[PDB]
Ligand binder design. Structure first.
Ligand SMILES: O=C(O)c1ccnc(NCCCO)c1
Ligand SMILES: [Cl-]
Ligand code: NI
Ligand SMILES: [Zn+2]
Length: 327
């Protein structure tokens, strides 16, 4: 078996290899990349997402989110408080202010130490899930707005014809802005491109050990576990690498820099944080190997998590018993 220790793999495709997206995902998996839950792809040196990031300051963040923490340094939850709308220009100025800017630090490891020591004592502002794209329409390779759709993948594999669409989202971050422990909706893949700015650090549990993370989460958040059988779908829980180690949970970490892609694989739990002002773009996608994960995916049983219009049809076709129970 390839990659048996489930290490995060890094790939350097040539411009020739960068032409066929589906074929290169299949290649990475032939080398065992999916066993880690996450892979990094560095684009060929001739490639670019767009010519310049001039004038991105005109984009609107209609509902910025203030991320307020509760708990202890290594085990906490965060709730999102809605703030008034601001432009990306206003947001970037706020991220660079004395109150919110990245602190002095020696290297990535020093800044990671400062994040986990001090995260809970601050409330950074996150611009998340903004429908849109920053890829140039003339960019033909790995353009996250020109991928084949999950609906067409299901039709090709299973003959199923369903409603729904599939478009990218933008994320504007600052120091300490946080994404909580989660897998994707319906345990889909995701692909994430860091367009501009400071790095993003990622943590990931191998898919073959995801149930170990779930068992620890039930022990650390017991009231949340009693209220919903799939509460990590709420995307509000954080657990530090020190606590994961103390409890024997297998995981890996890596830092993504501007100009790099990250792919998460079906049922790969991940979490992380931003180092400073940045802008990323992400979308979910599917392959033939995803279908069986879609059939087995857990669902939030209490109403807190959002189920989109498109996700409704996935549940209706792949999980008809759960759909009928919803009625
Ligand atoms: O912010 C990101 O770059 C990012 C990366 C991967 N998954 C995410 N899911 C949203 C969870 C919100 O707590 C967000
Ligand atoms: Cl700090
Ligand atoms: Ni994600
Ligand atoms: Zn729930």
């Amino acid at each position: 078996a390839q990659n048996p220790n489930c290490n995060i793999m890094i790939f350097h495709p040539t411009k020739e290899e960068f032409n066929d997206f589906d074929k290169y995902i299949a290649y990475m998996e032939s080398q065992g990349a999916h066993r880690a839950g996450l892979a990094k792809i560095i684009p060929p040196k001739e490639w670019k997402a767009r010519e310049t990031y001039d004038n991105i300051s005109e984009i609107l963040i209609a509902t910025p989110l203030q991320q307020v923490a509760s708990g202890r340094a290594g085990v906490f939850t965060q709730y999102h408080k809605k703030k008034k709308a601001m432009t990306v220009g206003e947001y970037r100025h706020l991220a660079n202010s004395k109150k919110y800017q990245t602190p002095p630090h020696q290297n990535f490891e020093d800044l990671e130490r400062k994040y986990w020591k001090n995260r809970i004592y601050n409330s950074p502002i996150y611009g998340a899930d903004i429908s849109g794209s920053l890829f140039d329409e003339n960019t033909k390779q790995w353009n996250l707005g020109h991928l084949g759709t999950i609906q067409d993948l299901l039709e090709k594999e299973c003959g199923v014809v369903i409603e729904g669409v599939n478009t990218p989202y933008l994320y504007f971050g600052m120091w300490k802005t946080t994404f909580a422990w989660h897998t994707e909706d319906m345990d889909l893949y995701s692909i994430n491109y860091l367009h501009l700015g400071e790095p993003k650090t990622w943590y990931v549990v191998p898919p073959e050990h995801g149930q170990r993370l779930e068992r620890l989460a039930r022990e650390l958040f017991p009231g949340s576990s009693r209220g919903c059988g799939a509460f990590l779908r709420h995307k509000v829980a954080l657990i530090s690498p020190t606590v994961l180690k103390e409890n024997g949970i297998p995981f890996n970490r890596i830092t993504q820099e501007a100009g790099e892609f990250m792919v998460t694989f079906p049922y790969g739990y991940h979490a992380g944080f931003n180092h400073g002002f940045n802008c990323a773009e992400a979308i979910n996608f599917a392959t033939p190997r995803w279908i069986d994960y879609g059939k087995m995916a857990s669902q939030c049983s209490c109403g807190e998590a959002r189920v989109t219009f498109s996700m409704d049809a996935f549940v209706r076709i792949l999980q008809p018993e759960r759909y009928d129970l919803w009625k």
